[PDB]
Amino acid sequence: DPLDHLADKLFHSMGSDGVYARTALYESIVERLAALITSHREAGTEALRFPPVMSRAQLEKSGYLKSFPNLLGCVCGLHGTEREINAAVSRFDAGGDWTTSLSPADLVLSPAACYPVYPIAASRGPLPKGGLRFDVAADCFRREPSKHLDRLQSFRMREYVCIGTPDDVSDFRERWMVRAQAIARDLGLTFRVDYASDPFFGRVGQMKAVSQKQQQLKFELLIPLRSEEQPTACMSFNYHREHFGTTWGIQDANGEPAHTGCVAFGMDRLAVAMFHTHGTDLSAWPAKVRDILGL
């Protein structure tokens, strides 16, 4: 793979595909990218930071199982008695299988940063005029093992989320599609923005994706890393219509089920994109790129 050469300076193996330790070099660029994204945050945007786990009940209610059940990471634990747990450990000691004593907790690993924000927004009552905007971030998980450096299981996601009328969300997405491209341009990245679809599971899934594409509910900023025919999506721009509004009983200022949308930044994909484009030697990065990153 064309990205493979970056591994030595950016990552250390943690004995599992798609799960890597991050070097100081790598993390310094993730941090600078995070700071750059923050500097573009719209006024009146509330910042929340989510842990890498969230309520399994909230995720189920959001309809995640209808869409990507194959990607979900669930938290499980030894929830039994001292006696049963001791027996699980004994099995392990004999080289047997302790994992049969596992049962699901009430938590999942969060598959996107925005999911926990909707119930939080709902609890505040009806939306003000102009809606609400959130700046959210989480370490996310997706059960898709791969050796490609742009396809991780554990990765950092940053999102700006808009909740309001169709117009509020539409205007928000349009601002951010322009703004995202300006950012990528100042970062010296090559890209295009194109219609896209989420990888819905199953036969029925395939068709949901076709319809999503036709309705243009999802755009991606695609950067050609390994090839120009197989570019990597490093940002997405998502319109959910009233799905979360209806699910969580969120009402806009005109008493209608709120619409929602988000702009998502894949922090690890953007950092890998930067190192691939500009190399691992930061002193040699282009002057304007070093400038806009505060290097």
Binding site: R203, V204, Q206, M207, K208, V210, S211, Q212, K213, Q214, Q215
Partner: protein, 33 residues
């Protein structure tokens, strides 16, 4: 445009189901819809 008509995701889902039901057939792309 089948989408300009007013067919959304669940509509298009139920649409792929109706084609498989009326005739006898069961890949799925944007072009053909």
């Amino acid at each position: 445009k089948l989408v300009d008509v007013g067919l959304t995701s669940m509509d298009m889902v139920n649409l792929m189901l109706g084609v498989e039901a009326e005739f006898d057939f069961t890949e799925i792309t944007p072009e053909n819809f």
